[PDB]
Amino acid sequence: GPSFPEPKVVRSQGGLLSLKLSATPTPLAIAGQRATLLTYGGSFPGPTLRVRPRDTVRLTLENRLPEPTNLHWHGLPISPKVDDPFLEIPPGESWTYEFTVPKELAGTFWYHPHLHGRVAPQLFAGLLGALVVESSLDAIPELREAEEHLLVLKDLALQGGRPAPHTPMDWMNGKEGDLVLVNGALRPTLVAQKATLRLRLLNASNARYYRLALQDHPLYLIAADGGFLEEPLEVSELLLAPGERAEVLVRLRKEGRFLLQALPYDRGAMGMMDMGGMAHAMPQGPSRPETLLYLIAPKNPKPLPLPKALSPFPTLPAPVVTRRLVLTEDMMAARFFINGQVFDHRRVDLKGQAQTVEVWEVENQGDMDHPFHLHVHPFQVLSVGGRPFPYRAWKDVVNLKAGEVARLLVPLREKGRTVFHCHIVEHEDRGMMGVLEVG
Template sequence: MATSATCNGQYDAVMPVKRNERLRLRLMNVANARIFTLALQDLEGWVMALDGMPLAQPEVAGTLTLAPGQRVDLIVDVTAEEEALLVRTEPNGEGWVQVAFPVRGQATATRRPAPIALPPNPNMATSGLNDARPVELLMEGGAMGGMAGATYQGQALGMRELVQQGQFWAFNGTSGRTDSPLTRASLGEAVKVRINNQTAFAHAMHLHGMHFREVLATGYGPMRDTLLVERGEIREVAFVADNPGKWLFHCHMLGHAASGMSSWIDVG
């Protein structure tokens, strides 16, 4: 079945602009399972925020990868004489125009200086992450995944029986959301989740209610609420449990969530 990639509900979207005009673009991937690889052409841009959280300093926009549920805020200057583009690259290497920006006149004679950082949102401090309590999340299942079976609704089922129930994936040996959370955290406690993707597919892990930082060899990444974990990867995210409640933690490929990849975190 063929699919079309649209922008604001339009295929071959066109947005007229002016030369030297400054735009603020919010790119949101609202597809169910599609991963978008995007780049600016004849536009100079800076990444200002990820998943609604401002960066400490703007970063020059290169290739942008957006998994389902991810967002990126850009400040963009129109440098084209006639037309600028937002280009999408497919997994097979083919390039397609996602949005065309035809130039209609001139906004100013000269360009503006590079943008400064957006003001931070409240509660972006993440002290104590170095002492975060570790939690394991093992992803299994799917085609070519080799999962023999998992627990579903309290019963140990083989893969054939799971498929008959519409369950194809598992977190820590369990398919589907359970009465018990992935972990319980005290309010203000720092938690670190090690995500081990043992499947043959990428998954966009999304946390409700809070934002996290990825644990990197050089420190901590920017605040996000959705992380794309490629096949075979092990990634770690850390966060301060600063919002009391029962919060979903699931794959944002919603078909994956409905067929096994859904858990939750209890805070408070």
């Protein structure tokens, strides 16, 4: 096959993407070993769905797992009556998701299970895939002529040819695996044919963070989770928390091999130690550095000029309310709270009004990083930890280090009941989720 593995793409046809996926245990070859994973479409990752604004999506999910499941269309601003976090598809049953892609939308999104209490093992076992919304901006020459690749970053651990089970410490920290894969492959080689690469990046891991850096090169950020920036932003490294997406341009500077690495990063994961009295909790400290892939630059590379503008960010109405959400932890219980409460699917936590703008102040009073996600309503990050954000773009996940406050601008779009939660999905399963009702 091609030196660089990427998931199969399914494209809409005549404005319609109509597909039947099955969620099923699947024998496959992965990282040089035979394993049984849970997959959509028979592959890991699942197929990449590629659509345009205003296309109709008709996706019938058949559940061939021994447990109930459902789909979350992560990042898409569609109705919570379609992207329904309370829906359960029993084993052997099917459900069809049908929606129109919003007109003012572009970027990389993804789909994965969202059935409260079962997300972490189902996501860890391989149930995820990407969705790309192609834009008219892809036709400007500085992007059209770049070589485009999707990179799904997902780690895994195998025990007896199956995904390793969760331990108690996994429920507290979030499970990380020792196989750190790109598109399901272990350290693939990307042989570039053009000097400018456009890389869509997706962190589909349960809990692992990727502090991304390409040897000898900066990255040019052009899209965040849910849309383009206003103009490219040069960065020396890019931290991708669970659930986050980015699109970056790489401008290859000379011939050679360059490693794309996940540099050491300390997210506050905890271990246990016994030195006399105790046992007591002790920080795991920073992650070990990982090589994600090998990037081979072509001969005599002469990258294109960067685009000078991308997409103007909309002028939002003045906000009508300020909310304050506080995140806290009980690590030894592996219990996680928002404003002192655990999730309850019958309780509405916040009531807002559609087509108004709200300011959400989300405060991490724990010691771990927590990546906060809101369904249905993408947001603009104004500041995090008191530092103003360096760009304007739609996001739907924002990472908060211990102690930090993020200030968001949240336009409320579709009416209905939806959720917000930590995207360390073990923490959501263990209660760090609440209910927003928009009317």
